[PDB]
Amino acid sequence: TLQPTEAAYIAGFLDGDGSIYAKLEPRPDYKDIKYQVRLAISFIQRKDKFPYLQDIYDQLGKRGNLRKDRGDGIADYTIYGSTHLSIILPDLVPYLRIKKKQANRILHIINLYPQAQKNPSKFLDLVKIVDDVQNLNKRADELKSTNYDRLLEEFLKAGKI
Amino acid sequence: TLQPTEAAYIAGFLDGDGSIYAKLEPRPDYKDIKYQVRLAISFIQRKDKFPYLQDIYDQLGKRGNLRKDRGDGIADYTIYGSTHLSIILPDLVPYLRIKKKQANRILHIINLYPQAQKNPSKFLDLVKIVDDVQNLNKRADELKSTNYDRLLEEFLKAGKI
DNA sequence: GCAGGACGTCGTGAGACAGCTCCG
DNA sequence: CGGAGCTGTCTCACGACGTCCTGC
Ligand SMILES: [Ca+2]
Ligand SMILES: [Ca+2]
Ligand SMILES: [Ca+2]
């Protein structure tokens, strides 16, 4: 399993060529709350260095999806989902620096997600942390995410609250 | 001094946001061989994360030059010269992946620098390793370096050989 | 004559997603 | 429905220097 200096390297790389992010995705097929909250970490690189992704994917138990070419000659590696992530993030957080907060927020969401699914109220708190993470991945001079505001309205103007 | 996972993190980050390069600089004031060979590693980042550079810089022994703003809102940290590098690289080499070759080429260069100085022949070998590093930092589809060819002819047409 | 630091930059290699599709 | 993998992209944030400037 994952060694320390192996975990700290990955953290160092993630912090440079990588991403920890959360998004609110539309779910027309759903019932009450028509949005699944997605969670991910990703590594990005020019396709010719793909084997270096392959590496970081092997050491991480081969969780996630390797892509030798998004299409624009860039290769990447995305790990979706609270399952992979509840196992991966904790190994990395201690060494993460730039994206530590983001990671700690992802876990935060993972710990709150279960009871948040069918509770429109507690789901708003969850969606807040989606704003926090996206915000973290912004310059302090850009528009700030607003899924929380844009969804409380859809909520109210629909009965759920 | 520099702890293992600390060096591993830095290796990971250097492999992502950083750079190990060598360049042949002209010196109109030098006597025979009017080129100093320059060696460096650097770390690049948006100026709102300077403290993470400050961090790495403190961790290395405060060697190098932090620059809160190059001028285009991007901050960077650059370590010039065999002296810092002969101290820093060895700590990083074991955890470097993508740029490990570059790092060794720099050490190799530092190893031959002394005798290469006033030997136009041995300077040409040392110049070849400069071509090799710049080459490493290139797609395999761009013009390849050749300070070697451009300096051989120069030497020849000037008597040095 | 030597070497270290500052200044500026062209050109992409990234980041952080939105949207799409598929799964049992 | 409930989650998870595949497709494509705008917009910058990097890389890898070249170039001028120091001081002794
Ligand atoms: Ca980066
Ligand atoms: Ca990179
Ligand atoms: Ca980068």
Highest CATH level, the class of chain A: Alpha Beta
Strand tally of chain A is 4
H-E string of chain A: HEEHEEHHHH
* Multimeric organization: homodimer
Report, as a whole number of angstroms, the end-to-end distance of chain A.
46 Å
Can you tell me the overall shape of chain A?
A: elongated
Number of domains of chain A: 1
Proportion of residues in β-strands of chain A: 15-25%
Q: Could you tell me the radius of gyration of chain A in angstroms?
A: 17 Å
Overview of the molecule:
The structure is a homodimer of 161-residue chains. The first copy, chain A, has 161 residues and is of the alpha+beta class. The first copy, chain A, has one domain (1-161): Endonuclease I-creI (Roll). Chain A has helices at 4-17, 50-58, 82-92, 100-112, 120-136, 147-156; strands at residues 18-26, 35-46, 65-67, 74-80. A four-stranded antiparallel beta sheet of chain A has the order 1-2-4-3. Chain A starts with a helix and ends in a 5-residue tail after the last helix. The interface between A and B is medium-sized, with 25 and 25 residues. The structure holds a DNA duplex (24 and 24 nucleotides). The PDB classes it as de novo protein/dna. Keywords: protein-DNA complex, homing nuclease, DE NOVO PROTEIN-DNA complex. It forms a tetrameric assembly. The entry is titled "I-MsoI re-designed for altered DNA cleavage specificity (-8G)".
